[PDB]
Design a protein around this ligand. Structure first.
Ligand SMILES: NC(=O)c1ccc[n+]([C@@H]2O[C@H](COP(=O)([O-])OP(=O)(O)OC[C@H]3O[C@@H](n4cnc5c(N)ncnc54)[C@H](O)[C@@H]3O)[C@@H](O)[C@H]2O)c1
Ligand SMILES: Cc1cn([C@H]2C[C@H](O)[C@@H](COP(=O)(O)O)O2)c(=O)[nH]c1=O
Ligand code: NA
Lengths: 453, 456
């Protein structure tokens, strides 16, 4: 009774964890928890996803993830199911299911409601439930808690309930998840103490307590709001630097040497647009609007970042005209299609906006992303990607790096110089190449341009 | 003879000779720091009162430790002053820190800068180094200052060094920051950049961050104030959003800022009662106007300025609303505004957001008493149209509200148990810029106060 909702971490028998949702977040969580000794079962409605995990397969490009899935599924500590039945035997249940938003920027509770309606009858006294899915504030306590209580139990008294925002760093997720402190917002002191004991023992990280689940839900929304609004500042700064003939990355690097606030001045890097950062700031805006608060910094940031794909296409076409090129003699090789660097997800990518604007004007575009699924590129771009990097760049008049994947940095530009059509423009969207690499491109005959570079 | 370096070898026995044009806040902080490390400095200013003060070892600038440093160095003879620009000829380095105010259209008023350059230009000799530190619109150093300095026959970069090095001092801790902050150097060429870097490293003992041009360094200064002002806007809107959920914005900011991001961490700034001073209310508009002239729209600046300009009025509306919810009216409540300065731990009220809060409260029918022991009483009369209270007891005795609109360290050290016996019960404690932790809020309630803040 003194230590509710979690066994002593020193117990010989392993901790039993059920993770609802076997997406990017769920898989990273499952692998890192199983790796530290817990017995984990990932629950997902997709039979294909469950079949892959059970056979130690993972198609996610996240570094070290496919290897860890294959190793842990073989040790038996990582398993998967389409059924929510393993919830009954679990000590901890983590909910990472999808929470999208409609055109009005209001939560689509469907997936979360369905997951909660499956967990509720299987929920047992003494269990700990943690919500990781990004949600509108008040959701854990006013929507999720009554759904979980439909099975007769009471949150905080019979089972622990806490909101812990997901803050995974793509491309380095497995490394960051083992060091990054977890924010815990308990639905009461018992739920707060148990959620903190769980992350410290099962994950081995520090914990940052906030006084309610609503406070922790706002931490997630405030983080995405801060990131989106700071990317908007950086994007506008890059367009200002471009008209002055100054390099935005030197400006940002020098500006960020000033201590300020809780750490340093932190101008974020500009890009080709934003693709968490397009829904969560609007989610806070709609919540604010319904409560009589206008979030003007969110409205402006979204308008600024939504204009960047069209501006990127305009800059590419303008630079090609300056090189004496046109839509009749140039094929553009778009290298990298994913919304974020070192990911393969193209579901909500600003690259779609760049390609559409380049095609809408009349340019021939080839797409290549070594991390993305070719069927997903067909679905989102409407065309099959190039068979390989060599096929994409051969005879291309422009190499537009619109996602800065690590394998693009390891490319031999001397070898690329022999495949492309001279004069070739290297447009740097998300590579953010250092001056030493830009000199190498010029040496091989490439023209180089970035927004504000 | 060989092409010349634009700075003498710091191995020479004679002290470095520096001339600082513009002995205001930035100029005086530089002068005492350079002279304190051994350089011989002459402060050149158009105000005869400032020149007379520096000569006598006096300084009217309230900046902590500044008057003391001036007194010590005037006695050594290393720091002197002049209304005349005749010391320029003998100097190794000329630093320009004159005022660059903007007009109603946010265009820079070049009057002081042109007058300074015109006096410097014919006294310049080959091999000298000229550093511009005043905040300017990009391209000012190369297209305005350089041709004015060349009127004597010298050619910038070939005959003398010209660099832009922005000042990044924060008011109240300027003397501590001038000796620690890395200096950004934007030379008009490689020789100017090398000399300016060697100058800051050897004469100030600080690190240097080179940027490729004077224009790049001019943008660094404007991008910094743009970033700060826009991030205060995010924080103020976040506090207003937290207020409707009843969540504490300081818990949210603290937890959010534990995430590594960019080149450091997520850095949500602290909310307040608005934004004052020249830096954050003028510099982002200067960038906006320069961008507009060149066909670039800075929408984040427009929104940040609108958001922060609305904060004083919103703060007064919150105080008035919380007083009504407490059962207090305009008839039985005198509000004591504690802290008038634009910033915590300074006395500067020249452009303070507290002015807007006080004016909006009075326009709601409330009597307001002002108390700020760090501020000049005459400065409060000129900005607020009323004399501040003689003492803390006069301000708080019988007050129905204690509105902490500047969070000076002095206010954190008050005896709230004693205050509780002087105020009119029930007394509202409004936290504008104290940012009290939950333990301190609990203590106020135990003493009988009603604590409120935006998003607290
Ligand atoms: N105030 C700050 O904290 C701060 C911080 C960073 C940057 N800056 C920039 O530094 C510059 C100076 O700021 P400040 O607050 O010290 O200014 P200030 O207006 O208070 O002082 C300027 C001084 O220059 C003198 N002066 C004017 N024209 C002159 C001339 N032709 N010859 C000689 N002296 C002349 C004036 O008499 C005055 O004493 C501004 O461009 C400002 O943007 C200020
Ligand atoms: C840094 C900072 C400044 N401000 C406001 C107070 C001052 O009026 C103005 C300038 O502050 P600064 O000189 O400390 O940057 O901006 C905030 O409200 N929150 C903050 O976090
Ligand atoms: Na609260």
């Amino acid at each position: 009774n003194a230590m509710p909702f979690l066994p002593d971490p020193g117990e010989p028998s392993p901790l039993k964890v059920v993770i609802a949702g076997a997406g990017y977040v769920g898989t990273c969580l499952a692998v890192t928890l199983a790796g530290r000794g817990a017995e984990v079962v990932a629950v997902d409605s997709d039979p294909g996803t469950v079949a892959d995990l059970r056979a130690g397969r993972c198609r996610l490009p996240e570094p070290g993830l496919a290897g860890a899935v294959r190793d842990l599924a073989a040790t038996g500590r990582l398993t998967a199911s389409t059924s929510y039945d393993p919830v009954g035997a679990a000590d901890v249940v983590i909910v990472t299911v999808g929470t999208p938003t409609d055109a009005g920027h209001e939560m689509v509770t469907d997936q979360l409601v369905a997951a909660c309606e499956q967990i509720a009858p299987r929920l047992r006294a003494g269990q700990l439930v943690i919500l990781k899915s990004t949600v509108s504030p008040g959701t854990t306590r006013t929507l999720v808690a009554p759904l979980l209580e439909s099975g007769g139990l009471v949150h905080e008294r019979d089972f622990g309930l806490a909101f812990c925002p997901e803050r995974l760093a793509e491309g380095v997720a497995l490394a960051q998840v083992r060091t990054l402190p977890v924010v815990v917002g308990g639905c009461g002191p018992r739920s707060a103490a148990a959620a903190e004991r769980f992350w410290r023992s099962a994950l081995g990280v520090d914990v940052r307590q906030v006084p309610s689940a609503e406070s922790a839900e706002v931490v997630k929304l405030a983080t995405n709001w801060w990131i989106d609004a700071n990317v908007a500042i950086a994007n506008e700064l890059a367009r200002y630097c471009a008209v002055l003939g100054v390099d935005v990355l030197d400006v940002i690097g020098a500006a960020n040497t000033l201590p300020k606030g809780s750490s340093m001045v932190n101008l974020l890097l500009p890009g080709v647009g934003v693709g968490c950062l397009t829904k969560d700031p609007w989610m806070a805006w709609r919540d604010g609007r319904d409560r009589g608060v206008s979030l003007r910094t969110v409205e402006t940031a979204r308008a600024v970042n939504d204009d960047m794909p069209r501006h990127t296409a305009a800059v590419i076409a303008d630079e090609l005209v300056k090189l004496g090129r046109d839509r009749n003699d140039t094929t553009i090789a778009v290298l990298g299609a994913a919304f974020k660097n070192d990911t393969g997800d193209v579901r909500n990518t600003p690259v779609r906006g760049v390609v559409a604007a380049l095609r809408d004007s009349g340019f021939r575009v080839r797409i290549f992303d070594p991390l993305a699924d070719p069927a997903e590129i067909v679905a989102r771009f409407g065309t099959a990607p190039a068979a390989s990097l060599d096929e994409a760049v051969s005879g291309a008049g422009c190499l537009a790096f619109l996602a800065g994947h690590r394998q693009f940095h390891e490319l031999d530009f001397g070898a690329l110089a022999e495949r492309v059509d001279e004069p070739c423009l290297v447009f740097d969207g998300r590579m953010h190449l250092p001056p030493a690499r830009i000199r190498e491109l010029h040496r091989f005959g490439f023209a180089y341009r970035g927004i504000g570079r």
